[PDB]
Design a protein around this ligand. Structure first.
Ligand SMILES: *[C@@]1(Cl)=[C]C2=C([C]=C1S([N])(=O)=O)S(=O)(=O)[N][C]([C]1[C][C]3[C][C]1[C]=[C]3)[N]2
Ligand SMILES: NS(=O)(=O)c1cc2c(cc1Cl)N[C@H]([C@H]1C[C@H]3C=C[C@@H]1C3)NS2(=O)=O
Ligand SMILES: N[C@@H](CCC(=O)O)C(=O)O
Lengths: 51, 52, 101, 50, 51
C-alpha cells in the first residue's frame, strides 16, 4: 500500500493531563527537554526507520 | 556597466560604448562559488587562459 | 500609525488573535532588537524575553521559538508554525554538461 | 481522562479544540497530517526481452 | 541562496506572555480555533508561497 498527496492539514500529538493536574507543568518541562536534547527524534527513528 | 563588445582571442575590445577604441587584454578569473576549479571547466579554462 | 505600519504573517496572526479574544492590540518593536537570552554574569534576560519579564508587554507575537530555558520564565502557546534548524548557502551555477556527456 | 479513570494520557491523542476543552495538552511531541492511503498501484518491472 | 539537506531538529514558534498573564489560555484556544480552520496555513501561504 502507498501514500498519495501530501498532508491535508496540520494536527499534532500532545501529552494530555486531566485539567488542572499537577502533572501538567512537569510533563511540559520534560517534553521540551526531550525536544531540546534530541531524544524524541531517535524515539521516532528507532520505530519508523530502523524497524 | 555594459557595451557592444567586439572580443578577440588575445584581447577583447568594444564599439559604440561611452568611449570607443579602448580594448582589454584577455585573462582568466575565478567566479562566485569558484567552479573555475571544476576539472571539465579547468581543462578548458586553463586552455582558454592561453593562445596555446 | 497604530498597527498598519507593519505588514506580515505575525501582523495577520495578531489581528486574528485580537479578533478572537476581543482585545485591541498595539504592535511595538523590541528595544534591543534581539529575540532574547539570559546573560552569563548579570543573568539579565535580553531581547523580547527581557521585555516580557520586565512587564513591557502583555503578549509577544514574533518568530520566537518555544525553548525550555524560556519556558522556565515565560509561557508559550501551542506552536502556530513549525520548523527546524537548517543550512543556507549560496547556490552554485547550474553545471554545464560534461565534455563526455 | 475526564471522568477520573486515568491520571494521564500518553498515546497518539490528537490535539484539538474540542479536546482541550476538557484536558490539557502539552506542546506536541510529533508532527503529522491527514493523508490518503490506497493499494500500491503496480510499481512495475520490465522483462528481460522488453 | 539555497537550502541543502534536512533539518537538524524540529521546533516551532509560540505566542509568549509574561508568566501567569491572563491571555495564555484564550490565546492557546485561539491558536487551536485557527489551526482547526486552516487559518494558519492560509496565512502561511499568503506570505511565503503567494510571494
Ligand atoms: C499547520 Cl497547518 C498547523 C499547525 C502547525 C503546522 C501547520 S503547517 N502544515 O506547517 O502549515 S504546528 O506548527 O505543528 N503547530 C500546530 C499546533 C496546533 C495544534 C496544536 C499544534 C498542533 C495542533 N498547528
Ligand atoms: N520529527 S517529529 O515529527 O517526530 C517532531 C516534531 C515536533 C517536535 C519533536 C519531534 Cl521529534 N517538537 C515541537 C515542540 C517542541 C517544542 C517546541 C515546539 C514544539 C514545542 N513540535 S514539533 O515541531 O511538531
Ligand atoms: N490519532 C487520532 C486517531 C487516529 C486517526 O484519526 O488517524 C486521534 O487522536 O484522534
Amino acid at each position: 500500500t502507498m501514500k498519495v498527496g501530501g498532508n491535508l492539514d496540520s494536527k499534532g500529538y500532545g501529552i494530555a493531563t486531566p485539567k488542572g493536574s499537577s502533572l501538567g507543568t512537569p510533563v511540559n518541562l520534560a517534553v521540551l527537554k526531550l525536544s531540546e536534547q534530541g531524544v524524541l527524534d531517535k524515539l521516532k527513528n528507532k520505530w519508523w526507520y530502523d524497524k | 556597466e555594459e557595451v557592444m563588445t567586439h572580443s578577440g582571442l588575445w584581447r577583447t575590445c568594444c564599439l559604440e560604448g561611452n568611449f570607443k577604441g579602448l580594448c582589454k587584454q584577455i585573462d582568466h578569473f575565478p567566479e562566485d562559488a569558484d567552479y573555475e576549479a571544476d576539472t571539465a571547466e579547468y581543462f578548458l579554462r586553463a586552455v582558454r587562459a592561453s593562445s596555446i | 500609525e497604530g498597527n498598519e505600519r507593519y505588514e506580515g504573517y505575525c501582523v495577520d496572526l495578531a489581528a486574528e488573535i485580537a479578533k478572537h479574544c476581543g482585545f485591541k492590540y498595539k504592535l511595538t518593536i523590541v528595544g534591543d532588537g534581539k529575540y532574547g537570552a539570559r546573560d552569563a554574569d548579570t543573568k539579565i534576560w535580553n531581547g523580547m524575553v527581557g521585555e516580557l519579564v520586565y512587564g513591557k508587554a502583555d503578549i509577544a507575537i514574533a518568530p520566537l521559538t518555544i525553548t525550555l530555558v524560556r519556558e522556565e520564565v515565560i509561557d508559550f502557546s501551542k506552536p502556530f508554525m513549525s520548523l527546524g534548524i537548517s543550512i543556507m548557502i549560496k547556490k552554485p551555477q547550474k553545471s554545464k554538461p560534461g565534455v563526455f556527456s
